[PDB]
Amino acid sequence: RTVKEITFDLLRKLQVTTVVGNPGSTEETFLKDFPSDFNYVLALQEASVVAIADGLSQSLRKPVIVNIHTGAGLGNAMGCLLTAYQNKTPLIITAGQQTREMLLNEPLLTNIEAINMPKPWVKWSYEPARPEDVPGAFMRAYATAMQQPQGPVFLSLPLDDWEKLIPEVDVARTVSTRQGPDPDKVKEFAQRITASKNPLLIYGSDIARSQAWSDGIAFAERLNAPVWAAPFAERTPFPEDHPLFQGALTSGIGSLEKQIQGHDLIVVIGAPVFRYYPWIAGQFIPEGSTLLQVSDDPNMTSKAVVGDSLVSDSKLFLIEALKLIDQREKNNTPQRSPMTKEDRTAMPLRPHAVLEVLKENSPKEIVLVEECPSIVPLMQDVFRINQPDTFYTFASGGLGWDLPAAVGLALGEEVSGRNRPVVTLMGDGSFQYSVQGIYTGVQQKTHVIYVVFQNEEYGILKQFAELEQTPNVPGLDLPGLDIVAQGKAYGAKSLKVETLDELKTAYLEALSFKGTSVIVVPITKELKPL
Amino acid sequence: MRTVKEITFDLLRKLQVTTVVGNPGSTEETFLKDFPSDFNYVLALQEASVVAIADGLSQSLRKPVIVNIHTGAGLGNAMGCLLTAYQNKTPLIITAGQQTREMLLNEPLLTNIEAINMPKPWVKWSYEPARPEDVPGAFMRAYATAMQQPQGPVFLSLPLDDWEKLIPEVDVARTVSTRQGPDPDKVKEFAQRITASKNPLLIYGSDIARSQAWSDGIAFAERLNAPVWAAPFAERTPFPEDHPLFQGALTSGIGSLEKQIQGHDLIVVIGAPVFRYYPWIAGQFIPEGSTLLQVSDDPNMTSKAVVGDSLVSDSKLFLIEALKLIDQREKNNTPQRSPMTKEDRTAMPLRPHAVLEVLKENSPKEIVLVEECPSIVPLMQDVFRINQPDTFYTFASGGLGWDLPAAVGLALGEEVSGRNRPVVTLMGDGSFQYSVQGIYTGVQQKTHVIYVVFQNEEYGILKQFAELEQTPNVPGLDLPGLDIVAQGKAYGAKSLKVETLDELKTAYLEALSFKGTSVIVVPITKELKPL
Amino acid sequence: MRTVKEITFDLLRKLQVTTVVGNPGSTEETFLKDFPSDFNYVLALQEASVVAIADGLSQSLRKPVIVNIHTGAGLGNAMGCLLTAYQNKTPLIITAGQQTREMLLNEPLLTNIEAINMPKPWVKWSYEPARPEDVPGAFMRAYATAMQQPQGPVFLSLPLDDWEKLIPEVDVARTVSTRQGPDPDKVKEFAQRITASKNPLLIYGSDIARSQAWSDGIAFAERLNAPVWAAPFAERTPFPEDHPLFQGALTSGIGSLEKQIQGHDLIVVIGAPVFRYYPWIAGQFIPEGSTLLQVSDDPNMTSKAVVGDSLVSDSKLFLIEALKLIDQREKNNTPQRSPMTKEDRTAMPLRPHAVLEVLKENSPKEIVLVEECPSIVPLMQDVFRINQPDTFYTFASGGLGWDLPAAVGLALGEEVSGRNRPVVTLMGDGSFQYSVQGIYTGVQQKTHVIYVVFQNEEYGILKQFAELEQTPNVPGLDLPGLDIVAQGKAYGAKSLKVETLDELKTAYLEALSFKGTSVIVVPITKELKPL
Ligand SMILES: Cc1ncc(C[n+]2csc(CCOP(=O)(O)OP(=O)(O)O)c2C)c(N)n1
Ligand SMILES: Cc1ncc(C[n+]2csc(CCOP(=O)(O)OP(=O)(O)O)c2C)c(N)n1
Ligand SMILES: Cc1ncc(C[n+]2csc(CCOP(=O)(O)OP(=O)(O)O)c2C)c(N)n1
Ligand SMILES: [Mg+2]
Ligand SMILES: [Mg+2]
Ligand SMILES: [Mg+2]
């Protein structure tokens, strides 16, 4: 049979039957007579292609294939590829390559030294040494991506390989997708925890990926210790209305340290130590304290700022550790403050008020995605996430990921059949990076609701300039954008609301409309402290 | 505040990494200034030997050893042995001096240009610290990266001017795990497959040696009463070779290995690649109708296996968990391997099997055995049936020039542990040349290492390959005119050539009684057995 | 159709690249099968020597030489000498066998994993052909890439199964330029600066040697009547060293070089980096008030210069064009360098300047001189004043282990050209060890090479550095217990130790009369002059 026929059969066996792509000449032999039992999802630009695939893969917990056009396409996708790598998403990135007949002399659209282009943001990058190896290379790509710590891989595929007649090969294999902790280390860590007087827990997003939500609750309740979310936790690791939950840690060395004072043992599960952002002088952890870290990614433990670490799937660790820790009595761990109420009469509208209007009109069953940097602490006050697989944002800080990722997550809602609407809180600046993603939402009829907070500026960059005392930075203002027209351009239901009652009406309408909507909300240019 | 150097050496003390194997240069002198008396510096004359000595020592001690070499020039000379350290999974911390930051931008003589890219793809991590302040922390990250499973070498490029800088005293010391266990769901799945199988066959690889799973591998095999084979090119003995269940070492062609494992429905590979093939011999990966399970501690190995269902795990952790889920089987007439054959000792020129027999029958119970004499491997496997852990060592990579210096490192390890076994090293005459300078370190350190050189005046195994693969008239396969006795003398070793098996016995016993480095040259037949 | 092998060898004939220096392995046997009689295969015992021999030969012939080594293991052993070939700008075609495409995907033993990345950053191009059909074309692209200015090595990874494939007969042979000239606008600008200067000073580097610009450099200097200095660490003589205008070799510190060139308003550097510094010596790049012009054939060199206005050009092409635009100047009392000093020959232990004088006064008019004895360089520069092109050679990189085997390659070149000059090689005892195996190739090929080993039982220049840079108590600087005579004997060379200057004279004259490889060991004082 042909390389193509055999390869698609392998993909059926692996149950990887979705291809998100933006086509080109070098991909046509792969896509020829695309089979009806596979799904091809078009996006208009490659950053959106990857991010859509990422959102879908996160939802389904299995690989999705990306198919993009040689070097030019891979290049457009590199920002979102970095983000997929940091999200630990097992994407199989494929790009067509010029025909082996001409490759040596590098004609137009040759992906020159292809394997080196996506470095350092893939687990493996490869261009098969012959057509006969293509199916085997897909199996190796799957195997590589799916073993812990999961992540994206890249295959460069010469266009002439697909039509080659080869004898059937049986390359299908299976692999493990988790590894457990060294039992000596679990005992060591448990001894430390048992001996501590006032432990504090910091949970990160490995807990979300590994489906350890309930195990994380059991562990925290066993200790009756305060729980914080690690700084810049991309996915909710702990129920945010639980009495033990304190909030999300700030992201400066000194600021985080101040937040965790008063505890002798700092126990970090499923997170880097630590995902800092601004520079704030200080000590990593309080004087007199010590720290333990669990991550499923040897890279994270290898570069931690402090502590004793072990490498483990978060769920397997939490299960093992639970067996060794005895129940502790209530210890008046504080309860976080109730949500505040913003002035809804202020004009221009204040973002906390906007968030409150969305929240009070939301069904329990939504997916919430966020890429609106300046309002994050306000969102954290208002949307207290209390279910798993509900909140998603990037692990990387790379703008242009969330808009298309929301479409991918919505596609996942249809595959699972759960069909929650995906409510996506977007900054006006962030909205621009991968604005083309809206088209895929409309064409695929995904239920996605974009709420755009229009302050006509890159707000968080002004918050930074304030904190770090860097005045007169250019390019921070965004006058003259018509975001409603942006929604209209790609066929979304799109409107601007000028009052909170209009917002409630537009939002309820969007919740009732099985399709993609854009709701633009003008807000104050004023900014809270970073 | 203290100097970068003082803080770094204090970290190394805390980490218990206090041996540096090196070949010095100008860019390393600021690192080596006032080298402290509680550390050991081991000089070797060329950088391939530097890395291999460190590799051998690190394998012996099961902790990192520091390599200190001279910028890009030194790193370059070391790259073959670094590839081998990577495939051995040895947690070496490779350091090379770099030109001073005062000049780096304009790349004066002996700048290691794009230093982080030079050792790729053969390190787990490569780095040049962004400031002197980061040097101690970079050593900690280097240690952490190297010591987490799957273990392996890392590289730091260190500008010479950093060492004398006064920097804030920051505590960078951390600890890490060095093992990861299996997914319990996968252990259950694998145990179910094993329990249901009619006639399972076990293939053990060297993860078992590194992870100290020797006894657990025996327990597992005895629980199943299944035949055990060593994986092809297993660098370190994974199973006692005189155990009734042990069948031998698998050959390294696809079709040849397949034929050896026929008659078994389930193939269970623990601690090995699937598979470390070498010659091209067409066939099927496993017998028609069979299926395969694989356990490796290295996700790279499982990701590229030719066949099977795999999981990633430390070998010891897997064997312990799996034992819990499998029931004892009755003896099932698993065959016993043939006794060692007896070569014709009357034949001249001397035959290597007889040479090996003479060494074996005169060896003490406790030796370390190292081998890099490719054409005699099957003969060695017949004669030296290794029945203790941490006894046999060779390269994982096939890169000649590793074993001669690695033997010195293993010997240094015997002195550190205090066990003090002699290291007997079986060397081909061609192989001996690649890193011949390593002998000097053996002599200078007074390591008890005995090199037995099998002199057939040829690259024998390449002629074996030329036959199997039908490539006549290949040049450069003959090695006339080498005086290997003189090579030993050149570096100060006890050195002599023996012409009879009685002379060999006398020389070998003498070398065993001499606490130092010896070379015994044995002329053998140029005739070669089949691959 | 014909086999990939037949077509490739036919291309190599057309390109006139018919020498292969190699160390064979299984993955190269299909390439070397039925090696043709009109090509020459030169065996060396270790891959650092393989590359350096090829480098020396390629420098002699001014065309590529093929290196054939064994997958990642062989390439690894060669990386230090490959770095050096790159900095020498030698157009070597480095080839390594790769595992068969039948198994490559699953990476069996001796796979060169990510082969194209291993030799980075030390090749102009690295490639593994996408199919057997592309192999001949890949050799053509390899040749083209290597031979275009700035010349340098390239790497091909060649799967063993490609060679026997029948492929369409396609004509892939092409030709390329090997030189590029200067922007005429920049020549005019530079000429104007030179003409306007009051007291210009010339610094010449080794591009002049490679580009055969010897006479053009003399014409240019005589036109200006300006003092000429050799750039620091000039690997090959750029100007006749007994010419009245020649001042000497510049020192290699920023502040020391600056002091040497004081008193001149315009510094004109032709065919050199600006500058190849080594020790850190603080100061200004050029004297206050002066300005600098630079010509190099390598855009990398001009891109990273510490100072000046530069242009990229072949040295010969620039010198020819510039000569046209500059007027003759009158003699301006440019000083004449001091005559060679005369060392005390009565002193014992023997002093290296006296040893050098004895070699010089007994040397024939036509020799090739190679040097890798770091501590004696200034003494050599005083004694051996090179006054002919293509006579003196050393490394551009400072990587020890290059010169010993490179001497063999230079000797092979003397036989190819037919000129047959003896190659006299001045070696330190430490330096001698790195690639000692190279001697074997000299002996086996019967090259006329005379190694004079300066034995001070130490890494002398590292002690000089420890003094200048105040790093006491550095370990590994002493080299007791080496029998270098035995090293020569080991590889079949004429070998002896001399204890007096009269014995040295006798041994040296004998080696000059013996068409083969000799080693002469000369014990010298351990005392060391200042850097
Ligand atoms: C691809 C990419 N480009 C630039 C940035 C830098 N960046 C971080 S926040 C930010 C401004 C976001 O502005 P907006 O989306 O309008 O949200 P706001 O802060 O105003 O609420 C920018 C440009 C980035 N993180 N990623
Ligand atoms: C660094 C390196 N260069 C070349 C090879 C290829 N090679 C494999 S076996 C071999 C010959 C070994 O000869 P010898 O040590 O004399 O052993 P014999 O086969 O004669 O017993 C060679 C050159 C290699 N494996 N590694
Ligand atoms: C491959 C390599 N390793 C180490 C060095 C560092 N190095 C420079 S000079 C030198 C000593 C040379 O000693 P020797 O050849 O005996 O000459 P001497 O200085 O005693 O005259 C060393 C080890 C180097 N330049 N290249
Ligand atoms: Mg904004
Ligand atoms: Mg041999
Ligand atoms: Mg010396």
Report how far residue C294's alpha carbon sits from residue C204's, in angstroms, rounded to the nearest whole number: 10
**Hey, is the C-beta of C116 within 8 angstroms of any chain A C-beta?**
yes
Residue B146 and residue B153 in contact, taking contact as beta carbons nearer than 8 Å = yes
| Residues making up the binding site of B for Mg(2+) | 429, 456, 458
The token pair at C482 is: 């080496």
Report how far residue B251's alpha carbon sits from residue C308's, in angstroms, rounded to the nearest whole number: 64
Q: Chain B to chain C, count of Cβ pairs less than 8 Å apart?
A: 282
**Hey, is the C-beta of A133 within 8 angstroms of any chain C C-beta?**
yes
* b/e A125-159 (16+ beta carbons within 10 angstroms → b): bbbbbbbbbbbbbbbbbbbbbbbbbbbbbbbbbbb
Beta bridge partners of C369: C392, C424
Helix (H, G, I), strand (E, B) or coil at A68: strand
Q: E strands of B122-265, at which residues?
A: 126-127, 154-159, 166-167, 180-181, 201-204, 228-230, 246-249
Cβ-based neighbours of C10, under 8 Å, separated by 6 or more: none
The values of phi and psi at residue A310, to 5°, are -145, 155
The values of phi and psi at residue C84, to 5°, are -65, -40
Ligand 1 pocket, A230 CB below 6 A? no
Report how far residue C416's alpha carbon sits from residue C57's, in angstroms, rounded to the nearest whole number: 9
Helix (H, G, I), strand (E, B) or coil at C64: coil
Q: How was this structure determined?
A: X-ray
Q: Which amino acid is at C54?
A: A
Give the 3-state secondary structure percentages of chain A, helix then strand then coil, rounded to 5: 40, 15, 45
Report how far residue C32's alpha carbon sits from residue A529's, in angstroms, rounded to the nearest whole number: 72
State the sign of the Cα–Cα–Cα–Cα dihedral B30, B31, B36, B42. negative
Other CB atoms within 10 Å distance of the CB of residue C196: 10
Cβ-based neighbours of C88, under 8 Å, separated by 6 or more: C55, C59, C235, C395, C396, C397
Q: E strands of C373-434, at which residues?
A: 392-393, 423-428
Domains of chain A with bracketed CATH = 1-175 (3.40.50.970), 176-337 (3.40.50.1220), 338-530 (3.40.50.970)
Pick the ligand that lies closest to the CA of residue A522. Answer: 4
R_g (Cα) of chain B, nearest Å: 24
Beta bridge partners of B451: B425, B519
The token pair at B331 is: 């003896």
| Sole residue written with tokens 């729980």 | A227
Q: Which amino acid is at A444?
A: Q
Pick the ligand that lies closest to the CA of residue C428. Answer: 3
The token pair at A496 is: 């601007």
The token pair at B18 is: 């206090």
The token pair at B109 is: 């003589």
The token pair at A499 is: 């009052």
Residue B489 and residue B495 in contact, taking contact as beta carbons nearer than 8 Å = yes
Name which of C32, C27, C165, C5 is nearest C100 in CA terms. Answer: C27
The values of phi and psi at residue A499, to 5°, are -135, 165
Residue A83 and residue A396 in contact, taking contact as beta carbons nearer than 8 Å = yes
Using CB atoms within 10 A of its CB, is residue C149 exposed (0-12), middle (13-18) or buried (19+)? buried
B433–C490 CB contact, under 8 Å: no
Helix (H, G, I), strand (E, B) or coil at A392: strand
The token pair at B121 is: 């793809």
| Residues making up the binding site of B for thiamine diphosphate | 373, 375, 398, 400, 430-431, 456, 460-461
How distant is the Cα of C91 from the closest Cα of chain B, in angstroms?
Answer: 19
Angle at A474 between CA A470 and CA A475, to 5 degrees: 125
**Hey, is the C-beta of C283 within 8 angstroms of any chain B C-beta?**
no
**Hey, is the C-beta of C141 within 8 angstroms of any chain A C-beta?**
yes
Report how far residue B7's alpha carbon sits from residue B37's, in angstroms, rounded to the nearest whole number: 16
* b/e A194-213 (16+ beta carbons within 10 angstroms → b): eebeebbbbbbbbbbbbebb
State the sign of the Cα–Cα–Cα–Cα dihedral A11, A13, A15, A17. positive
| Residues making up the binding site of B | 373, 375, 398, 400, 429-431, 456, 458, 460-461
Report how far residue C430's alpha carbon sits from residue C400's, in angstroms, rounded to the nearest whole number: 9
The values of phi and psi at residue A383, to 5°, are -90, 90
Report how far residue C452's alpha carbon sits from residue C280's, in angstroms, rounded to the nearest whole number: 31
Residue A98 and residue A159 in contact, taking contact as beta carbons nearer than 8 Å = yes
Other CB atoms within 10 Å distance of the CB of residue B202: 24
Q: Which residues of B touch A176 (CB under 8 A)?
A: 182-183, 186, 302, 310-313
Q: Which amino acid is at B301?
A: M
Q: E strands of B385-432, at which residues?
A: 392-393, 423-428
The token pair at B348 is: 């001249």
Q: E strands of C256-316, at which residues?
A: 266-270, 291-296, 309-312
Beta bridge partners of A454: A522
Give the 3-state secondary structure percentages of chain B, helix then strand then coil, rounded to 5: 40, 15, 45
Report how far residue C366's alpha carbon sits from residue C423's, in angstroms, rounded to the nearest whole number: 10
Residue A260 and residue A291 in contact, taking contact as beta carbons nearer than 8 Å = no
Using CB atoms within 10 A of its CB, is residue C188 exposed (0-12), middle (13-18) or buried (19+)? middle
The full length of chain C comes to 531
Q: Please identify, by atom number, the ligand 3 atom nearest to the C-alpha of residue C429.
A: 16
Q: E strands of C316-435, at which residues?
A: 368-372, 392-393, 423-428
To what resolution in angstroms was this structure determined? 1.6
Q: Which amino acid is at C170?
A: V
Largest CA distance in chain A: 73
Compute CA distances B228 → A396, B306, C135, whole Å.
48, 20, 43
**Cα C508 to averaged position of ligand 6 atoms, centre (Å):** 20
R_g (Cα) of chain C, nearest Å: 24
Q: Please identify, by atom number, the ligand 3 atom nearest to the C-alpha of residue C461.
A: 19
Cβ-based neighbours of C8, under 8 Å, separated by 6 or more: C135, C136, C139, C163
Closest chain C residue to B437, measured at CA? C433
Beta bridge partners of B425: B370, B451
- From C462, C464, C478, C482, the mutation candidate for ligand 3 (largest count of ligand atoms within 8 A of CB) is C462
Beta bridge partners of B98: B159
Compute CA distances C468 → B139, B402, C378, C462, C463, whole Å.
28, 36, 16, 10, 9
Query: Which residue's alpha carbon is at the smallest distance from atom 21 of ligand 3?
Result: C375
Ligand 2 pocket, B438 CB below 6 A? no
| Sole residue written with tokens 């064409």 | A443
Report how far residue B365's alpha carbon sits from residue B360's, in angstroms, rounded to the nearest whole number: 10
The values of phi and psi at residue C335, to 5°, are -70, 155
- Which pairs with CB-CB distance under 8 Å and at least 24 residues apart come from A396-400? A396/A82, A396/A83, A396/A86, A396/A87, A397/A232, A397/A277, A398/A79, A398/A80, A398/A82, A398/A83, A399/A371, A399/A429, A399/A430, A399/A433, A400/A47, A400/A51, A400/A79, A400/A80, A400/A430, A400/A433, A400/A434
Q: E strands of A244-300, at which residues?
A: 245-248, 265-269, 290-295
* β-pair type (B266-270, B368-372): unpaired
The token pair at C329 is: 């100047």
Other CB atoms within 10 Å distance of the CB of residue B345: 16
Residue B75 and residue B96 in contact, taking contact as beta carbons nearer than 8 Å = yes
The token pair at C497 is: 């130790």
The full length of chain A comes to 530
Angle at B372 between CA B370 and CA B373, to 5 degrees: 120
Using CB atoms within 10 A of its CB, is residue C38 exposed (0-12), middle (13-18) or buried (19+)? exposed
Name which of A8, A3, A68, A60 is nearest A37 in CA terms. Answer: A8
Report how far residue A313's alpha carbon sits from residue A303's, in angstroms, rounded to the nearest whole number: 18
Report how far residue B82's alpha carbon sits from residue B122's, in angstroms, rounded to the nearest whole number: 7
Q: Which residues of C touch A129 (CB under 8 A)?
A: 101, 104-105, 128, 130, 159
Pick the ligand that lies closest to the CA of residue C476. Answer: 3
R_g (Cα) of chain A, nearest Å: 24
The token pair at C1 is: 């159709």
Beta bridge partners of C42: C21
A130–C101 CB contact, under 8 Å: yes
The token pair at A196 is: 């501590």
Give the 3-state secondary structure percentages of chain C, helix then strand then coil, rounded to 5: 40, 15, 45
Residue A440 and residue A48 in contact, taking contact as beta carbons nearer than 8 Å = yes
Cβ-based neighbours of B460, under 8 Å, separated by 6 or more: B374, B375, B428, B430, B526, B528
- Helix B403-417 to helix B438-445 angle, to the nearest 10 degrees? 20
Helical spans, DSSP H, in B232-311:
254-260, 299-303
The full length of chain B comes to 531
